[PDB]
Design an enzyme around this catalytic site. Structure first.
Site, PDB file in Angstrom:
ATOM      1  N   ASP B   6      -5.720   4.115  -0.246  1.00  0.00           N
ATOM      2  CA  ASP B   6      -4.466   3.470   0.096  1.00  0.00           C
ATOM      3  C   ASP B   6      -4.221   2.467  -1.031  1.00  0.00           C
ATOM      4  OD1 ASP B   6      -2.314   1.832   1.078  1.00  0.00           O
ATOM      5  OD2 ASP B   6      -3.452   1.229   2.860  1.00  0.00           O
ATOM      6  N   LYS B  67       3.188  -2.172  -7.595  1.00  0.00           N
ATOM      7  CA  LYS B  67       3.802  -1.150  -6.732  1.00  0.00           C
ATOM      8  C   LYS B  67       5.334  -1.350  -6.533  1.00  0.00           C
ATOM      9  CE  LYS B  67       3.089   1.072  -2.342  1.00  0.00           C
ATOM     10  NZ  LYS B  67       2.086   1.261  -1.275  1.00  0.00           N
ATOM     11  N   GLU B 171       2.209   7.528   3.208  1.00  0.00           N
ATOM     12  CA  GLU B 171       1.423   6.607   4.043  1.00  0.00           C
ATOM     13  C   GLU B 171       1.517   6.919   5.551  1.00  0.00           C
ATOM     14  OE1 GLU B 171       2.772   2.791   2.428  1.00  0.00           O
ATOM     15  OE2 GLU B 171       1.845   3.288   0.479  1.00  0.00           O
ATOM     16  N   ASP B 195       4.833   0.138  10.876  1.00  0.00           N
ATOM     17  CA  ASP B 195       3.960  -0.435   9.832  1.00  0.00           C
ATOM     18  C   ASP B 195       4.385  -1.865   9.507  1.00  0.00           C
ATOM     19  OD1 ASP B 195       2.514  -1.163   7.549  1.00  0.00           O
ATOM     20  OD2 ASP B 195       2.901   0.704   6.446  1.00  0.00           O
TER      21      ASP B 195
END
Ligand code: 3P1
Lengths: 111, 377
Positions: B6, B67, B171, B195
């Protein structure tokens, strides 16, 4: 009134007291170098360079002290744990006195 | 051996499926997650905990949030917006962002995938140190909203790191796999992945038919996470301190940082206890601050924000052309989903439906990635 549990808190606090000494020593080492540097031996540009490396180091020292305070701030001490309470308060004040010392240096060099 | 990674905005996690179960792998500091941070110094490159630890000493040569940049154009609304926040330099290199720093006293530029490759190298070294074997094969995850450019730049980060990236997977899909939602037999299933992390909130709806995944919709909130809940507590305690002591700690950055760190920890305590205490000696002008807060007080302070997490959920359902009764599985990921009130608001919204929440919500994405890595190996 002394309880076995206060031993555990007193031990934690002693370990933090030793950590604080380790950091205080870095500050003393820093200050000794500073005097040598400032004592004007290097060209002014190289002196400035050296003083900035020292400034970065005093910032590390401040952050190390801040981390100790955060660790001390996780403790919860009953009113009856007088010895532990006194040692906690005394250690916080010591750290704050050392932070005042760092700020003096920080705010004198590499402006 | 094959690993699941991850690759997260703020933290990364690596797992391995071995002896019939996934092991989430601890780093050298013993931590089951690693800060997605890279630091350049006079003598060396630091990645992970060491880089995050020295942010204050070296903030202009310490890179995070790669990211948010990977695979985007320099003039992307996201890159433009974030730049003003980052203390490191972001350079424009023919329309593509590069990060610029000093490293061993020489100026160097890196593309986002180069920075992410350094984070992946660390996660690879982490698995190697644990397994005592070379590790080459990985599955790496990305957000479901990532476009082709962001996915390819992520794959390239892996390759630069010496990884054989078996597959780039979404994800929310990895989270579903972790719970074995694709092993469930029957007809088509609609899965909602909720999430909620420290800074961002993503909701995703997928359909699974016969072990086969499809992304139906995505929604979320760019500016909502655990930091926002901490701040509501911070402001609560600053007001309390002014009320009792008639002194304003808000201009003292160190006092506010002590308070903020204590609030974030008390928050975590309130996910398992109904009250939390705080004792900060000599918080400001020598004044001690000893206080407590109840779970109900914490809930009240965040009541708008918590209820607000249901708006992306409604949005995602509209976009997926589904009714809330057509959702079969709900999965919680992200560290802030541990908040009892959030779980209750969601369990109520779905008229009492059960939640998939037993896997550590910080590790569940890595966990699914590791399961699929062993499958594809
Ligand atoms: N029980 C919890 N209850 C509420 N929020 C929680 C939480 N655990 C974590 N995170 C896991 C965590 C975070 C710090 C820790 C520190 C020491 C030991 C365990 C820890 N575990 N978060 C939030 O998730 C965001 C991402 O983490 C942050 O907003 C964080 O507050």
């Amino acid at each position: 009134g002394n309880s076995p549990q206060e031993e555990v808190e007193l031990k934690k606090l002693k370990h933090l007291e030793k950590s604080v000494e380790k950091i205080a020593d870095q500050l003393e080492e820093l200050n000794k170098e500073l005097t040598g540097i400032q004592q004007g031996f290097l060209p002014k540009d190289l002196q400035a360079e050296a003083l900035c490396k020292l400034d970065r180091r005093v910032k590390a020292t401040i952050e190390q002290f801040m981390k100790i305070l955060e660790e001390i701030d996780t403790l919860i001490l009953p009113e009856n744990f007088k010895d532990s309470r006194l040692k906690r308060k005394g250690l916080v004040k010591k750290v704050q006195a050392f932070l005042a010392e760092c700020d003096t240096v920080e705010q004198n060099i590499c402006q | 051996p094959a690993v699941g990674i991850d690759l997260g905005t703020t933290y990364s996690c690596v797992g391995v499926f071995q002896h019939g179960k996934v092991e989430i792998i601890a780093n050298d500091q013993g931590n089951r997650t690693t800060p997605s941070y890279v630091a350049f110094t006079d003598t060396e490159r630091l990645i992970g905990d060491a880089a995050k630890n020295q942010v204050a000493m070296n903030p202009t040569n310490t890179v995070f949030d790669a990211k948010r940049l990977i695979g985007r154009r320099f003039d992307d609304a996201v890159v433009q917006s974030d730049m003003k926040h980052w203390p490191f330099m972001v350079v424009n290199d023919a329309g593509r962002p590069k990060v610029q720093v000093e490293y061993k006293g020489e100026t160097k530029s890196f593309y986002p995938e180069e920075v992410s490759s350094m984070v992946l190298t660390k996660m690879k070294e982490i698995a190697e140190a644990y397994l005592g074997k070379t590790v080459t094969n990985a599955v790496v995850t990305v957000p479901a909203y990532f476009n082709d450019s962001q996915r390819q730049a992520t794959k390239d980060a892996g390759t630069i790191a010496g990884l054989n990236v078996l597959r780039i997977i979404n994800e929310p899909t990895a989270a579903a796999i972790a719970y074995g939602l694709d092993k469930k037999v029957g007809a088509e299933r609609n899965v909602l992945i909720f999430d909620l992390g420290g800074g961002t909130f993503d909701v995703s709806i997928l359909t699974i038919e016969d072990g086969i995944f499809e992304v139906k919709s995505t929604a979320g909130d760019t500016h909502l996470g655990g930091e926002d809940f901490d701040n509501r507590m911070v402001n609560h305690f600053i007001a309390e301190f002014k009320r009792k002591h008639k002194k304003d700690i808000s201009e003292n950055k160190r006092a506010v940082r002590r308070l903020r760190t204590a609030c974030e920890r008390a928050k975590r305590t309130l996910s398992s206890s109904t009250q939390a205490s705080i004792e900060i000696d000599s918080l400001y002008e020598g004044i001690d601050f000893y206080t407590s807060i109840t779970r109900a007080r914490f809930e009240e302070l965040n009541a708008d924000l918590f209820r607000g997490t249901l708006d992306p959920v409604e949005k995602a359902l509209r976009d997926a052309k589904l009714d809330k009764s057509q959702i079969h599985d709900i999965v919680l990921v992200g560290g802030s989903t541990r908040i009892p009130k959030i779980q209750k608001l969601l369990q109520d919204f779905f008229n009492g439906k059960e939640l998939n929440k037993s896997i550590n919500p910080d590790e569940a994405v890595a966990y699914g990635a590791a399961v699929q890595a062993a499958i594809l190996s």
